[PDB]
Amino acid sequence: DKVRKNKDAVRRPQADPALLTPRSPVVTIMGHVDHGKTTLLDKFRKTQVAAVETGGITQHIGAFLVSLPSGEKITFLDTPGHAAFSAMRARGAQVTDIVVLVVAADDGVMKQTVESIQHAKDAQVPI
Amino acid sequence: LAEATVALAEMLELKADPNGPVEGTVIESFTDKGRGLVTTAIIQRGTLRKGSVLVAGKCWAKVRLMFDENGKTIDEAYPSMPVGITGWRDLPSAGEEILEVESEPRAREVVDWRKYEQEQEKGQEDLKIIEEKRKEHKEAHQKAREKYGHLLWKKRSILRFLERKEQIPLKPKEKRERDSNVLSVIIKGDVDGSVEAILNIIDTYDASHECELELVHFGVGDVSANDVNLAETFDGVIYGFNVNAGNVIQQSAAKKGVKIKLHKIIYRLVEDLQEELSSRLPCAVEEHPVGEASILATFSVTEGKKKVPVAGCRVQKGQLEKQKKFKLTRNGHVIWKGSLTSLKHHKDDISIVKTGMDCGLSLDEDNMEFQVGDRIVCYEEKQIQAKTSWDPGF
Amino acid sequence: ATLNQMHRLGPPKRPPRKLGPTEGRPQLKGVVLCTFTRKPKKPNSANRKCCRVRLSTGREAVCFIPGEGHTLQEHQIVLVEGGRTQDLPGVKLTVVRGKYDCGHVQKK
RNA sequence: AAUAGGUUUGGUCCUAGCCUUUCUAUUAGCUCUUAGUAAGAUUACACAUGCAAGCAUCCCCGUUCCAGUGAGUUCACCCUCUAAAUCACCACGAUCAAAAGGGACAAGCAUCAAGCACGCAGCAAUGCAGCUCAAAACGCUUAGCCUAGCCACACCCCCACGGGAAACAGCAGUGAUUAACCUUUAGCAAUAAACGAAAGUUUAACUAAGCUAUACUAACCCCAGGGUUGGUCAAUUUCGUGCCAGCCACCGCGGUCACAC
Ligand SMILES: Nc1nc2c(ncn2[C@@H]2O[C@H](COP(=O)(O)OP(=O)(O)OP(=O)(O)O)[C@@H](O)[C@H]2O)c(=O)[nH]1
Ligand SMILES: *C(=O)[C@H](CCSC)NC=O
Ligand SMILES: [K+]
Ligand SMILES: [K+]
Ligand SMILES: [K+]
Ligand SMILES: [K+]
Ligand SMILES: [K+]
Ligand SMILES: [K+]
Ligand SMILES: [K+]
Ligand SMILES: [Mg+2]
Ligand SMILES: [Mg+2]
Ligand SMILES: [Mg+2]
Ligand SMILES: [Mg+2]
Ligand SMILES: [Mg+2]
Ligand SMILES: [Mg+2]
Ligand SMILES: [Mg+2]
Ligand SMILES: [Mg+2]
Ligand SMILES: [Mg+2]
Ligand SMILES: [Mg+2]
Ligand SMILES: [Mg+2]
Ligand SMILES: [Mg+2]
Ligand SMILES: [Mg+2]
Ligand SMILES: [Mg+2]
Ligand SMILES: [Mg+2]
Ligand SMILES: [Mg+2]
Ligand SMILES: [Mg+2]
Ligand SMILES: [Mg+2]
Structure with a gap:
């Protein structure tokens, strides 16, 4: 049996009920291009970043630890809406607990809105 | 909410x-x-x-x-x-x-x-x-x-x-010349997720027949000497996405002939990627028909001790020009493609014969046989910039 | 030579040892350009897998891939080392198996 | 080059080169139990952050030291003379030691052979026409060295008024780059330095720890791998391949009996 011994580090088994302590939710703002994802995030972040961007397009996934007025803390993952960043949207859906789908009323459902919904179904996260 | x-x-x-x-x-x-x-x-x-x-x-x-x-x-x-x-x-x-x-x-x-x-x-x-x-x-x-x-x-x-x-047998050169229609690209990005996005877009290329897109190297960070050296080695183009290139790196690229193309928006970097692919593509010639003339009588003229077959033709629609290229048509088939050796009308050389003008036509190819009913369609050829068929989905 | 002749000249000056393709360095990093084959000089007959790589120094030399079989393609990164290939004239560099893209020869 | 060896030829001798066996240091691959000690960026490329020089009854002193690096490179040694400095102080001489003067001092290339004002006398005016060099002048390239240590540099322009311009070649750490890759520990308890009359304070010097088969020392109930196996050179069973695939430091092997893959 001259085979390399397995020395990998694996994920710990699911936490025991006793150990489990309540934690903050992770939320992702998913949607189509120029449907207001960043503008919505800014109002809760209380900071304006939309104007301070190249072309006003979100090309990165950023996690911000917002503190709600009630005293709760939420982590907002602002995903890009452009078609190029399909991988970024899938990765956001895999670490999120809730998906806030921003569907603009004027335009409605779009190609990337359906894609955002599909990623949520695969991750099985409430929308 | x-x-x-x-x-x-x-x-x-x-x-x-x-x-x-x-x-x-x-x-x-x-x-x-x-x-x-x-x-x-x-x-x-x-x-x-x-x-x-x-x-x-x-x-x-x-x-x-x-x-x-x-x-x-x-x-x-x-x-x-x-x-x-x-x-x-x-x-x-x-x-x-x-x-x-x-x-x-x-x-x-x-x-x-x-x-x-x-x-x-x-x-x-x-x-x-x-x-x-x-x-x-x-x-x-x-x-x-x-x-x-x-x-x-x-x-x-x-x-x-x-x-x-x-x-x-003949031994082929161990080092072979890269064909003109080959675009080598170096992709450098600010973050790893941005680079993967550009690499997935380069995996949606389907026009390899017309031109080939090669990825020499991809990485995260500012443009470096290795990127310039890799671009000079493979005659590639460096595409920066939200990254910078210093004067030392930019000056080195000038000496080595490398083209650094720093961008900040992904739709801009793809449009520029398509412009470089289009340049590699071959120039698409546009054939515009100039005139058409039907042959009538075939003559054998003796000039300089050489028998010159002369096709007597009647211009029906359009005109014929000495510069514009010609092609021979036999009952719908295409027999010949080339330019007249001598255009001579009524013992006088005329560059442009109008509709209804009689003109004797001699070709440069002696193997071409002229019949009584052959047709000739003149045309003008203009090279047209060819754009890449590859569309990235946006 | 005489003692007076030996005094004028002086200690023998050892010719500066010449450097090889590695520039006096153990290994070097290079990028694969081509992947061809070469035939040995008489009396050996074979097709030997070689590759033209551009080193980090800037030069572009021909290297020999040892072992049975390989999957080296253009743009890959390989670590080269010294060691002449006796059959092949003008081949002085050898690719390091098990380093960078190049992988160990699969058993059997 | 040694106690030597192998290899020129059809063969012998001679000569001669290449290689082998020895010992280290990097790096690579495969592999790896512990303990203690030592040592520990590839690069004078660019540097986020934090710390690294204070003391003290106000003046002064100190931060010109240590620590670091190796770009450049005959300022380092001896003699003469003689400042600053210590010996509380005037003085004394001693000690230490710069500048100045004399001497000495890397390697390669002569396909660098001539340099071009490099000398002397004289109080001065000024006069004379010399001086160095095939025993290597002038010059070019390379390199830190002669190691209780020393020299040199301190972002660059030798220098630093000035300018470019905005500096980790201080510790830790990073990017780029390279075959080359140590912690963004603690404490001033010991020693050293600084300040103070002093108790004392400070110090990424240092000490004591951390990481890492680089090296040495020691050990282990369990726990061994790596590379060799034609000769040189210690040591191969049986298959498969069939001048193919592949192998060797050298000579060489493989064309259906391969101790060489
Ligand atoms: N009138 C109006 N304009 C809005 C509203 N929400 C957003 N916008 C505008 O829509 C545009 C796009 O806003 P962004 O915040 O960039 O939208 P996004 O969906 O995050 O954009 P990507 O990151 O490119 O997908 C901006 O010009 C906003 O001002 C809204 O409720 N009303
Ligand atoms: C030759 O001269 C040409 C022949 C026409 S046959 C109908 N006519 C005029 O130039
Ligand atoms: K936008
Ligand atoms: K042979
Ligand atoms: K030095
Ligand atoms: K200096
Ligand atoms: K102390
Ligand atoms: K004081
Ligand atoms: K056999
Ligand atoms: Mg946005
Ligand atoms: Mg040999
Ligand atoms: Mg023989
Ligand atoms: Mg011999
Ligand atoms: Mg010192
Ligand atoms: Mg004195
Ligand atoms: Mg002196
Ligand atoms: Mg010469
Ligand atoms: Mg040096
Ligand atoms: Mg200076
Ligand atoms: Mg510096
Ligand atoms: Mg440091
Ligand atoms: Mg680093
Ligand atoms: Mg090391
Ligand atoms: Mg401290
Ligand atoms: Mg230690
Ligand atoms: Mg090792
Ligand atoms: Mg064997």
Whole structure:
């Protein structure tokens, strides 16, 4: 049996009920291009970043630890809406607990809105 | 919406053990010049502190600095917290799970076992390719050997010498010229997720027949000398995405002839990528019909001791011009393609014959046979800029 | 030579030892450009797998891939080392198996 | 080059080169139990952050030291003379030691052979026409050295008024780059330095720890791998391949009996 011994580090088994302590939710703002994802995030972040961007397009996934007025803390993952960043949207859906789908009323459902919904179904996260 | 989000989260009853080896996921990974290799991550189990040894795929780290979105150091990262982590000995891929290990030698042991597994998976893939190359060669070897029987090798070389006296092969240059329609690109990006996005767009290229897109090297960070050297080696083009190139790097590219193309928007960098592909494409000639004339009588003229066949033609629709190219048409078939050697009308050379003008037509090709009913269609050829067929979906 | 002749000249000056393709360095890093084959000089007959790589120094040399079979393609990264290939004239560099893209020869 | 060996030829002798056996140091691959000690960026490329020089009844002193690096490179040694400095102080001489003067001092290339004002006398005016060099002048390239250590540099322009311009060749750490990859520890308890009349304070010097088969020392109930196996050169069973695939430091092997793959 001259085979390399397995020395990998694996994920710990699911936490025991006793150990489990309540934690903050992770939320992702998913949607189509120029449907207001960043503008919505800014109002809760209380900071304006939309104007301070190249072309006003979100090309990165950023996690911000917002503190709600009630005293709760939420982590907002602002995903890009452009078609190029399909991988970024899938990765956001895999670490999120809730998906806030921003569907603009004027335009409605779009190609990337359906894609955002599909990623949520695969991750099985409430929308 | 804020109330609805809070309500649903409470219904979900989210809970995570806050103690024990840290678990997490990488959200972004990038290179900082001052802070080094940095990965933004979200904690999922346990609490992260300075000095925690972390493994993520083929990269491990010992937490040196923990900072928040604003850069302020944080002492602890409880579950479901965003936290930039420094101290990575290699750059983790985006989306890779993070696990905490007891010590640095244990981390290196874990990484050494993940690299080995990757090498075995590549090795098995390589084996099928090699077995294919080695099976083909063994057939060509058994065939040429079995050309003659299992006779003494001295005879086979002598019998082959008989057919070696009939053999004259030419060796092809070991280094062959890259064809004009080949675009080599170096992709450099600010963050790893941005680079993967551009690489997925380069995997949606379907017009390889007209022009080929080669990816020489991809990486994260500013343009470097190696990128300029790799671009000069393969005559490639460096595309920067939200990255900078210094005067030393930009000046070096001028001497080496490399083209650095720094962009900041992904639709801009793709449009420019398509403009370079279009340039490589071959110029699409546009054929515009100029005139049409039907032959009537064929004459044999003796000039300079040479018999010149002359096609007498009547221009029906349009006009014929000496410069514009011609083609011969036989009952719908295309017999010839070329230019007239001599255009002469009524013993006078006329460059442009109008509709209804009689003109004798002699071709430069003597093998062309002129009948009573042949047709000739003149045309003007204009090269037209050809655009790449590849569309990226946006 | 006489003692007076030996005094004028002086200690024998050892010719400066020449450097090889590695520039006096153990190994070097290079990028694969081509992947061809070469035939040995008489009396050996074979097709030997070689590759033209551009080193980090800037030069572009021909290297020999040892072992049975390989999957080296253009743009890959390989670590070269010294060691002449006796059959092949002008081949002075050898690719390091098990380093960078190049992988160990699969068993059997 | 040694106690030597192998290899020129059809063969012998002679000569001669290449290689082998020895010992180290990097790096690579495969592999790896512990303990203690030593040593520990590839790069004079660019540097986030934090710390690294204070003391003290106000003046002064100190931060010109240590620590660091190796770009450049005959300022380092001896003699003469003689400042600053210590010996509380005037004085004394001693000690230490710069500048100045004399001497000495790397390697390669002569396909660098001539340099071009490099000398003397005289109080001065000024006069004479010399001076160095095939025993290597002038010059070019390379390099830190002669190691209780020393020299030199201190982002660059030898220098630093000035300018470019905005400096980790201080510790830790990073980016780029390279075959080359140490912790963004603690404490002033010991020694050293600074300040102070002093108790004392300070110090990323240092001490004590951390990482790492680089090296040495020691050990272990369990726990061994790596490379060799034609000769040189210690040591191969049986298959498979069939001048193919592949191998060797050298000579060489493989064409259906391969101690060489
Ligand atoms: N009138 C109006 N304009 C809005 C509203 N929400 C957003 N916008 C505008 O829509 C545009 C796009 O806003 P962004 O915040 O960039 O939208 P996004 O969906 O995050 O964009 P990507 O990141 O490119 O996908 C901006 O000009 C906003 O001012 C709204 O409720 N009303
Ligand atoms: C030749 O001269 C040409 C022949 C026409 S046959 C109908 N006519 C005029 O130039
Ligand atoms: K936009
Ligand atoms: K042979
Ligand atoms: K030096
Ligand atoms: K200087
Ligand atoms: K002390
Ligand atoms: K004082
Ligand atoms: K056999
Ligand atoms: Mg946005
Ligand atoms: Mg040989
Ligand atoms: Mg012989
Ligand atoms: Mg000999
Ligand atoms: Mg010193
Ligand atoms: Mg004195
Ligand atoms: Mg002196
Ligand atoms: Mg010459
Ligand atoms: Mg030097
Ligand atoms: Mg200076
Ligand atoms: Mg510096
Ligand atoms: Mg440092
Ligand atoms: Mg680094
Ligand atoms: Mg080392
Ligand atoms: Mg301290
Ligand atoms: Mg220590
Ligand atoms: Mg080793
Ligand atoms: Mg064998």
